Structure 1
């Protein structure tokens, strides 16, 4: 009902996601980036090589490469020492809150860049039931408290709150 209501300021409605309907080892931030990327790739392909299209897509490809390295440590279980020499990188642009490679400020701009491109003032992420298998719901709870903190994003979850307590 919520996604239908907001599909009519303007709040973009993501297709509803659920950790239950996914491979167990799959993270949550990687999915929301994937789920957001398809919703920005569909619009840009609508332009089909316009002057504005090239400028906007150049902004997107530049930013995603920034997220790939910082998140790449989370992709693999063991964190190799080679990342530390590669993890460190001087940059004053994008308003890095803290150095190294941290996704708290990188992903906020990624959410931001969607808003100018999609001409929307808010980003909505809707979830489904995790009562089916709440063991994997911890990574959702960690991602929502770590990489969901921008004033221009809204996140909607559901379920039985006692299972969260459990």
Structure 2
């Protein structure tokens, strides 16, 4: 059933023919939310895997996006969209000021390119920077709670 819904992750457009397969409740799993929800399907997939593996939680670990920090947007999006369960623990590594630079670039992509070019005055541009800074500081707060953030110490601090 996860393979049936993987097209949503990679589709470049919506196919109206898939609406007939987004309406079937033939699955005995009885997913609470209607329609094929990749977040929901992965939840019982992880819940099933915990019973098979006989463990309370599964630890998903990600390396640091250093040689290519554009690849970390999928990591950030997959954590919030899918890896949100009591059975899942996520640990990520990387420069926080590099993830912030990555999130900041994405928050600027939600602005229409016409608006950016046609509103260059300081009063509007400054407000855009305040909104983007506020938008991406809350993104990091939701994705990475501060009480769970851990900073690696250097020799001078060791």
**TM superposition score category, shorter chain reference:** 0.5 to 0.7
Match for 1:150 among 80, 85, 102? 85
Q: CA deviation at 1:73?
A: 2.2
**Once superposed, what is the RMSD of the aligned Cα atoms?**
1.7
3-state DSSP of counterpart to 2:69: coil
Structure 2: gaps spanning 5 or more residues? 102-158
The TM-score normalised by the length of structure 1 is 0.56
TM-fit CA distance, 1:72: 2.1
Residue 91 of structure 1 deviates from its aligned partner by 4.9
Write the distance in 1 (CA, Å) between the matches of 2:32 and 2:73. Answer: 26
The answer to whether the aligner puts 1:160 opposite 2:130 as a matched pair is: no
Q: Which gives a bigger RCO, structure 1 or 2 (Cα 8 Å, sep 6+)?
A: 1
Query: Is residue 2:7 matched to residue 1:79?
Result: no
Alpha-carbon distance in structure 1 between the residues aligned to 2:18 and 2:30: 22
| 133-142 or 82-91, larger mean C-alpha shift | 82-91
Taking structure 2 as the reference length, the TM-score comes to 0.58
Kindly tell me the number of residue pairs found equivalent between the two proteins.
101
1:3-50 deviation per Cα after TM superposition (whole angstroms, max 9, x unaligned): xxxxxxxxxxxxxxxxxxxxxxxxxxxxxxxxxxxxxxxxxxxxxxxx
Task: State the shift of 1:75 in Å.
Answer: 2.9
> Any gaps of 5 or more consecutive residues in structure 1?
1-65
Tell me, in whole angstroms, the C-alpha distance in 2 between the residues paired with 1:150 and 1:94: 17
- Tell me if structure 2 keeps the 8 A contact 1:115–1:123: yes
User: 1:80, 1:141 → 2: CA distance?
Assistant: 26
CA separation in 1, counterparts of 2:42 and 2:62? 19
The answer for the alignment partner of 1:111 in structure 2 is 46
Partner of 2:23: 88
Are 1:100 and 2:29 an aligned pair?
no
Task: Say whether 1:137 aligns with 2:72.
Answer: yes
Per-residue deviation at 1:97?
A: 2.7
Q: Structure 1, residues 132-166: CA drift from partner, whole Å, max 9, x if none?
A: 21112111111100101110111111000001110
